[PDB]
Amino acid sequence: AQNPNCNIMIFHPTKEEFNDFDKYIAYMESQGAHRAGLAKIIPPKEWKARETYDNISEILIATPLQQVASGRAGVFTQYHKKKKAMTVGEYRHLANSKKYQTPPHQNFEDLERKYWKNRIYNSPIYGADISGSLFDENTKQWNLGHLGTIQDLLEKECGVVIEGVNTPYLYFGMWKTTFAWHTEDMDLYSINYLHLGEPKTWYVVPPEHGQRLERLARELFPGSSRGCGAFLRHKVALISPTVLKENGIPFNRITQEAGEFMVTFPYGYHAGFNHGFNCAEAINFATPRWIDYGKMASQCSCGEARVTFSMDAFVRILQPERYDLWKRGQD
């Protein structure tokens, strides 16, 4: 078995290997990358996502989210308070202000220490989940707006034609902005490209050990667990590396820098934080190996998780027994 310790792997494809996206994902899996839940892909030196980032300041963040924490430093939840619209240029200036800017630090490890110590005492503002793309239309390799769609994959594998579309999302971050512990909708893959700015630190649990994380989460968030049998679908709970180590949960960590791709694999729980002002782009995707994970994915039916239009068909076709209850949660 390849990669039996479930380490995060880093790949350096050549420009020739960067042509065929599906083939390279299958190659990474042949080397055991998926066992970690997360992989890093450094593009060939010849590639670029677009020519410059000089003209992005007029993009609108219609609903910036202030991430307010409750709990203790290593075990907390966050809720998202909606703020007034602002442009990317206005958000960048806010991120660089004395109130929100990254503090002085020695290295990534020192910054990680400061994040875990101090996150809860601040409420950073996240420009998350903005439909759109920063890939130039002429970028032909690993262009996250030109991938094969999940609906076309289901159709190719299973023969059933379904409604829905699959488009990317932009994330404009600042120091301490946080992504809570989650897997993707329907336990899909995700791919994330860091276009510009300061790094993003990730934590991940191997897919084969995901239920260990879920059992800890039910212990640490006992009211939430009573409310919903899949409450990590709410995307609000944080647990620190120190707490994970104290409870014997297998995980790994890695820092993504500008110009790098990360791939999350089906049922790989992940969480993390931004180091400073940055912009990422991400989208979900599927492969043939996903189908069995999609059929087994947990679902939130309590009403909190509320998701996209396109998840309807995935539930309806892959999980017809769950469909009626899940749909009530959506309505």
Ligand X SMILES: O=C(O)CNC(=O)C(=O)O
Binding-site residues for Fe cation: 182, 184, 270
Q: Which residues contact 17 (CB under 8 A, 6 or more apart)?
A: 24, 27
Figure out which of the listed residues 39, 49, 174, 228 binds Zn ion, where binding follows CB under 5 A: 228
- Distance between CA atoms of 198 and 257, rounded to whole angstroms? 7
Give residues in contact with Ni ion (CB under 5 A).
Answer: 190
Q: Report what 134 binds from Ni ion, Zn ion, Mg ion, none; CB cut-off 5-8 Å by kind.
A: none
Q: Are 38 and 262 in contact (CB under 8 A)?
A: yes
Q: Report what 171 binds from ligand X, Mg ion, Ni ion, none; CB cut-off 5-8 Å by kind.
A: ligand X
Q: Scanning residues 239 to 278, which ones bind ligand X (CB under 6 A)?
A: 264, 270
State the residue for tokens 């990422």: 280
Minimum separation from the CB atom of position 87 to Mg ion (A): 8
Helices 150-158 + 311-318 axis angle, to 10: 20
Of 154 and 191, the one with the shorter C-beta distance to ligand X is: 191
Q: Report what 304 binds from Mg ion, ligand X, Zn ion, none; CB cut-off 5-8 Å by kind.
A: Zn ion
Minimum separation from the CB atom of position 308 to ligand X (A): 14
The token pair at 50 is 């677009």
Annotated binding residues: 126, 182, 184, 192, 200, 228, 234-235, 270, 300, 302
Secondary structure letter of residue 136 according to DSSP: -
Q: Report what 58 binds from Mg ion, Zn ion, ligand X, none; CB cut-off 5-8 Å by kind.
A: Mg ion
Annotated binding residues for 2-oxoglutarate: 126, 192, 200, 235
Q: Are 306 and 201 in contact (CB under 8 A)?
A: no
Q: Which residue number places its CB atom closest to Mg ion?
A: 58
Minimum separation from the CB atom of position 64 to Mg ion (A): 16
Q: Are 283 and 147 in contact (CB under 8 A)?
A: yes
Figure out which of the listed residues 130, 186, 217, 282 binds ligand X, where binding follows CB under 6 A: 282
Exposure on the CB side of residue 233, measured as CA atoms within 13 A:
22
Q: Which residues contact 105 (CB under 8 A, 6 or more apart)?
A: 111, 114
Of 81 and 156, the one with the shorter C-beta distance to ligand X is: 81
Q: Report what 133 binds from Mg ion, ligand X, Zn ion, none; CB cut-off 5-8 Å by kind.
A: none
Minimum separation from the CB atom of position 149 to ligand X (A): 17
Residue 165, Cβ density class (10 Å: 0-12 exposed, 13-18 middle, ≥19 buried) = exposed
Residue type for position 102: T
- CA angle (248 as vertex; 242, 249 as ends), nearest 5: 80
* Residue 304 binds Zn ion, judged by CB under 5 A: yes
- CA angle (10 as vertex; 111, 7 as ends), nearest 5: 80
Q: Scanning residues 1 to 60, which ones bind Mg ion (CB under 5 A)?
A: 56, 58-59
Of 190 and 287, the one with the shorter C-beta distance to Ni ion is: 190
Of 33 and 61, the one with the shorter C-beta distance to Mg ion is: 61
- Distance between CA atoms of 145 and 133, rounded to whole angstroms? 6
Minimum separation from the CB atom of position 250 to ligand X (A): 19
Secondary structure letter of residue 119 according to DSSP: G
Q: Scanning residues 152 to 191, which ones bind ligand X (CB under 6 A)?
A: 171, 179, 190
Minimum separation from the CB atom of position 1 to ligand X (A): 25
State the residue for tokens 């579309």: 165
Note the residues at the interface with ligand X (CB under 6 A).
Answer: 171, 179, 190, 192, 264, 270, 280, 282
Note the residues at the interface with Zn ion (CB under 5 A).
Answer: 228, 300, 302, 304
